[PDB]
Amino acid sequence: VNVPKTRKTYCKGKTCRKHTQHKVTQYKAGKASLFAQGKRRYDRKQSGFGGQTKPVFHKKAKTTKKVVLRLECVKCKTRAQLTLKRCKHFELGGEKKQKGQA
Amino acid sequence: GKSHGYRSRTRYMFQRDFRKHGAVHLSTYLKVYKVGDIVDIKANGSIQKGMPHKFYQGKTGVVYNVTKSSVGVIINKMVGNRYLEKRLNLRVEHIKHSKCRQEFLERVKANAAKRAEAKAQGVAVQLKRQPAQPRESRIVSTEGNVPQTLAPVPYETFI
Amino acid sequence: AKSKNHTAHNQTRKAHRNGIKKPKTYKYPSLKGVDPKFRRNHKHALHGTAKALAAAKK
Amino acid sequence: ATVQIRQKVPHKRTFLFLEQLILKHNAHVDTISISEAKDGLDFFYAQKNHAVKMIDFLNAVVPIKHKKSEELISQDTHTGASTYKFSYSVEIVPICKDDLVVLPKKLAKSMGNISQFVLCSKISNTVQFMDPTTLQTADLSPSVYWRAPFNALADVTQLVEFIVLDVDSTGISRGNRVLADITVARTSDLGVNDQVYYVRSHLGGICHAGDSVMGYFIANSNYNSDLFDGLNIDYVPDVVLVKKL
RNA sequence: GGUUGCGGCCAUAUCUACCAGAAAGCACCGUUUCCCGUCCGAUCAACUGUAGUUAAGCUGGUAAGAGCCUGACCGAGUAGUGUAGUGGGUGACCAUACGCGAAACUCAGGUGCUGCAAUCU
RNA sequence: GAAGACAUUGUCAGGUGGGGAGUUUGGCUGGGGCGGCACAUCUGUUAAACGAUAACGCAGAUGUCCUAAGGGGGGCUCAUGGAGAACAGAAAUCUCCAGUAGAACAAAAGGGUAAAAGCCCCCUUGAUUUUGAUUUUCAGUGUGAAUACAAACCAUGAAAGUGUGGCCUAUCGAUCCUUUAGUCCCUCGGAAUUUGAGGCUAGAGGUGCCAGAAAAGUUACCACAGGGAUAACUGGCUUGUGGCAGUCAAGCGUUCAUAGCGACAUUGCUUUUUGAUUCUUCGAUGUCGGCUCUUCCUAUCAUACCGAAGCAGAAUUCGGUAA
RNA sequence: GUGAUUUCUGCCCAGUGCUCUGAAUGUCAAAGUGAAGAAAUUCAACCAAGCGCGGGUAAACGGCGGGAGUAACUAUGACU
RNA sequence: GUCGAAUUUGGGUAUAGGGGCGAAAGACUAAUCGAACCAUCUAGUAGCUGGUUCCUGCCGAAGUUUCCCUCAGGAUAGCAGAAGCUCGUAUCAGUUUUAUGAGGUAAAGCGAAUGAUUAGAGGUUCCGGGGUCGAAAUGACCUUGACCUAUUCUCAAACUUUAAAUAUGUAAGAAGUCCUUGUUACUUAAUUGAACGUGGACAUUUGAAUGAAGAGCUUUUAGUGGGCCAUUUUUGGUAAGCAGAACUGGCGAUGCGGGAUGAACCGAACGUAGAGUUAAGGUGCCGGAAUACACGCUCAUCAGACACCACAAAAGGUGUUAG
RNA sequence: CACGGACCAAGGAGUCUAACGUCUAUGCGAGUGUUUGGGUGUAAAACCCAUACGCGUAAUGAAAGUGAACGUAGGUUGGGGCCUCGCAAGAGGUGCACAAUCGACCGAUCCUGAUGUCUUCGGAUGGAUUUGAGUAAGAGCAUAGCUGUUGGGACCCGAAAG
Question: What are the boundaries of the region Disordered (chain C)?
Answer without folding.
Answer: 1-36
